[PDB]
Design a protein around this ligand. Sequence first.
Ligand SMILES: [Zn+2]
Ligand SMILES: [Zn+2]
Lengths: 278, 279
Amino acid sequence: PLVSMKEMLIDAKENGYAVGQYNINNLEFTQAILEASQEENAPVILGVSEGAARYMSGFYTIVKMVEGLMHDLNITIPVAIHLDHGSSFEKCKEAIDAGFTSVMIDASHSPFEENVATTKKVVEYAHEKGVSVEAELGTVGGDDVVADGIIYADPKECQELVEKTGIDALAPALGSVHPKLGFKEMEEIGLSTGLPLVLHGGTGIPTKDIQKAIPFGTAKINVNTENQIASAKAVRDVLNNDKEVYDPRKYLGPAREAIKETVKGKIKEFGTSNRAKH
Amino acid sequence: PLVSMKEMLIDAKENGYAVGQYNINNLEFTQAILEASQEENAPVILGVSEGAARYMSGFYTIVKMVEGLMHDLNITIPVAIHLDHGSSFEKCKEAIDAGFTSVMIDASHSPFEENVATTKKVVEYAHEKGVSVEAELGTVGGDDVVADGIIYADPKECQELVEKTGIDALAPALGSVHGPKLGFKEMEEIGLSTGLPLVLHGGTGIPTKDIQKAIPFGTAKINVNTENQIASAKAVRDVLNNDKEVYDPRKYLGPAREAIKETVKGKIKEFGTSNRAKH
Ligand SMILES: [Zn+2]
Ligand SMILES: [Zn+2]
């Protein structure tokens, strides 16, 4: 069923696993992520950036497409449709009104008090529609910037944002780049806020650091470039080995397969397999 | 709005133009075809083969996607969703129940009496749902076969199938090949005697002037597929061969989409479909 992130991330946090957010960019991306998660009996979060949504014509198109696939692929796992790095209240409202079940309102580059106000406004609207809300504090690093442009989430800011806004999940940047995670800080923030935590900039973080972060409260981990890299490699391989092929299905089919196998790998990493219940 | 092909092809036949059927294979194909036709103020038919539908997970997924796009792209032109080369009553029914507005039941390789029976069955179901129906007679050629595997549709068969089944459009193979010289006088007699809009399969590579000749003889629907696949694949290759580092799917499938869009506009200009969509 289409659900928000709320209960799936609470279950993830409570039982020591994470649910991947896999970003979608078109039909084939969405098929691969849904099939992979269903085959793994795992809940899943479908991530949509604002740029990806423009590319896919709009939020409503995306929701329609997912509704189609839920039916045709016989999806029975929990599925959230999540606005990734939402830039404003208006954009969050637009996604929600089109049928999104979750939004991240990203005001982490604004003054903290403005982050609180804008996030609070998004939660008030979203919670009226059953939509879960993620917010962000701190900055993900990565040219030539001191401390590699890393700015840890402040534990007092984290606590205060949670208490004042009522968000369902928190993304505290704690050393990830786009690396050495502040596991001590992560533990403190998870315990103090009592919220499932979200990991951005996960691409390239070793499985061992990924699996250390998870019991410290990381319950959602974002995945995007890994799928793009794997799909693009499969397209290149098809086109480079057959100079005559033009049927889109003959290079985008393998791209879809490569995503599917990338996602199953992340699912195994994250412990998400067999967490979908009735 | 979403409509069958019925009124669409009647208006085309009456006024001397054709509506392209542009086959979709995924989201970017559908976007390009809809945008191009809207921008040309032209009605359009979205063609879906059974293999393309399997690739896109199903008929229902395709209808939902199109509904999404109709909204987000502010589509105001007539749009038909058409099952291309439907292979059975069951497949035609499945597509119609999922929300398709048009089907082609292709029994042209079966004995003529079976073609009539299966097609009649499809029309009875489809017409109670407001769905238009295309059927086919004759064979599109193209290996080392006598007469290049071309078998003209039989005028008596054409006449009889139309009368017995009540189809809305007819695809009479008349010299098209796939992989040529159209029988223009045969096309004329069949158009005249059946009184139906005619469909051209195997249009790829038919020179613009034979296309231009076919239309006033009654050809009101022309199918377009490989031309789009060729243009989109070339755009992808060019992106990937010029930049070995790129992996963002939008950076090569975006240009693919634009390439389809410009291909479709070209066909729209050939077919005379521009500015035929009424408010
Ligand atoms: Zn992120
Ligand atoms: Zn055909």
